[PDB]
Design a protein around this ligand. Structure first.
Ligand SMILES: CS(=O)(=O)Nc1ccccc1CN
Lengths: 237, 300
């Protein structure tokens, strides 16, 4: 069925699974026209497809040309997402195909179920977790590859860098969701925290800085403080 | 006019004949139903006074044989049987009519209700949904499941309606996923009409039979089938104009006949609101929308 806090360790078991988030597929800027009406301009987007056990991220870049001449784009975006996830599954060897795909938004269930009818044994599930994957475009190297794309493209990343050499996938997922929640709540301050110390750098082959174990504890504390600080600013607490 | 005699009525029972019904007391001198209109299928149905569990009954057409009802004290139900001795049968009926031991099928001359509910229903198609080839009539009851229900358990006692499933490979062409899911015209026109049913008359016959089994027996799988066959049409952007006009008439008479007090269990809110107010055909069912809004405005 649906995925929640009761069955949370299921994410880190040995059954291959993917999260799919479609919140950055169809992206627009809204502006005034010369006549004073309002129009949208699409910008490149991405599908965020993540294995939470291994950290492997299949980032399908959605180039603005896919919307040309199409109507009802917010509806089309869900079906394009499901089309691309289905194509990804079919591209993987059988032993790498997921046994479950967890969508972060319930509106993706029917499009994905329909595109995956050929795979009756892959479960398509919603979740009651509120996951901050929309903030993926706050990760500088991911935003850069999306914005520079001139055509459709798939780029593979490990969203955990090398963390699994030192921590479990449960802890790595918790660190990722804390970082992304902080970037979603106050992007400027979160990036300040992550980069304030110029002696800690991001390796060329990594997304996040090369913090020691003790430095990650400090960073994580500062991110929790940031989230709490913004919560107090929001609700006047 | 044809006649279905009863050997006797040993147990108290409410007897239905098409949309009519009457009560028979235990051991009352009741010997059947006369003046049954030729030209239509009919259903004779039962609900025992001491155990309303299991409504059951029989679909038949008097042009196909001479049929009678006899209670079976072992199996505990009124059974339909065929009499092959025509002279015996005529003699039995004449005696019971002379003694005025039969109810008359009470059709008002002005009243086309039964024709309107059975216009496309044919005994030959009934006998393919309800499989018991040794009889010319077909038994249905409240509890019988459909083939589709069994997939999701005795196959000999099932209702073999045509399986309709909107999230199935039959309904969705590889490469046209969004198109076929949001506009079911392919599935309606190519898969179902051209492929399975052959013509719209056979499709409407099955739809009408599903409705009638839902209404007369409280058969849940029949109700599911009726709504699925409506939704498939309403969710198609391309439907022949003659089919939409006929559907409106079919549904109008079904909604008109439904007991007001059964509307809560026989009508699916989601399907009807979708069909009348959101679907491609939301403006094509004028007669049905008007009777629905005036008779069951709560459901909407
Ligand atoms: C079955 S039955 O016998 O009650 N029928 C019937 C029909 C017409 C008039 C009178 C009767 C019986 N009182």
């Amino acid at each position: 069925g649906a995925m929640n806090s009761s069955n949370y360790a299921e994410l880190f078991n040995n059954d291959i699974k993917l999260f799919v988030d479609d919140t950055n597929v169809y992206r627009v800027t809204v502006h005034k026209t010369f006549e004073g009406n309002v129009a949208t301009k699409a910008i490149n987007g991405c599908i965020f497809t993540l294995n939470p056990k291994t950290g492997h991220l299949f980032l399908k870049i959605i180039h603005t040309s896919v919307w040309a001449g199409q109507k009802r784009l917010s509806q089309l975006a869900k079906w394009k997402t499901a089309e691309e996830v289905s194509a990804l599954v079919r591209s993987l060897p059988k032993e790498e195909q997921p046994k479950q795909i967890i969508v972060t938004r319930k509106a993706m269930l029917d499009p994905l179920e329909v595109h995956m009818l050929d795979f009756p044994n892959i479960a398509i599930r919603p979740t009651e977790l509120r996951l901050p994957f929309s903030a993926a475009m706050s990760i500088d190297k991911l935003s850069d590859v999306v914005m520079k794309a001139t055509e459709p493209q798939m780029v593979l990343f490990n969203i955990y860098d090398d963390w699994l050499d030192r921590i479990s996938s449960y802890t790595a997922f918790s660190r990722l969701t804390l970082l992304l929640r902080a970037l979603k709540t106050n992007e400027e301050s979160a990036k300040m925290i992550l980069l304030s110390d110029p002696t800690i750098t991001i390796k060329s082959y990594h997304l996040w800085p090369s913090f020691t174990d003790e430095q990650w504890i400090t960073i994580e504390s500062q991110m929790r403080d940031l989230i709490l600080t913004e919560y107090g600013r929001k609700y006047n607490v | 006019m044809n006649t279905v005699p009863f050997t006797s009525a040993p147990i108290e029972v409410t007897i239905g004949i098409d949309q009519y019904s009457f009560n028979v007391k235990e051991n009352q001198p009741f010997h059947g139903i006369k003046d049954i209109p030729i030209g239509h299928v009919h259903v004779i149905h039962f609900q025992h006074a001491d155990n309303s569990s299991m409504r059951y009954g029989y679909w038949f057409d008097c042009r196909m044989g001479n049929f009678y009802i006899q209670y079976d004290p072992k199996d505990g139900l009124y059974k339909m049987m065929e009499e092959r001795d025509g002279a015996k049968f005529e003699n039995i009926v004449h005696n019971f009519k002379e003694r005025q031991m039969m109810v008359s099928y009470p059709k008002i001359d002005e009243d086309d209700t039964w024709y309107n509910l059975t216009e496309f229903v044919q005994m030959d198609k009934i006998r393919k949904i309800v499989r018991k080839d040794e009889n010319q009539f077909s038994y249905v009851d409240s509890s019988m499941t459909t083939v589709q229900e069994n997939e999701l358990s005795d196959p000999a006692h099932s209702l073999n309606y045509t399986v309709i499933n909107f999230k199935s490979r039959e309904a969705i062409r590889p490469g046209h996923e969004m198109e076929d899911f949001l506009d079911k015209s392919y599935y309606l026109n190519t898969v179902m009409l051209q492929g399975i049913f052959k013509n719209s008359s056979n499709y409407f016959g099955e739809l009408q039979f599903a409705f009638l089994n839902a209404m007369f027996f409280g058969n849940y799988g029949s109700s599911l089938q009726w709504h699925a066959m409506i939704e498939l049409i309403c969710s198609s952007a391309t439907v022949p104009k003659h089919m939409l006009d006929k559907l409106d008439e079919i549904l109008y008479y079904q909604i008109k006949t439904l007991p007001e007090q059964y509307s809560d269990i026989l009508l699916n809110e989601r399907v009807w609101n979708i069909c009348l107010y959101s679907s491609f055909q939301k403006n094509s069912l004028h007669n049905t929308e008007k009777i629905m809004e005036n008779k069951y405005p709560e459901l909407l």
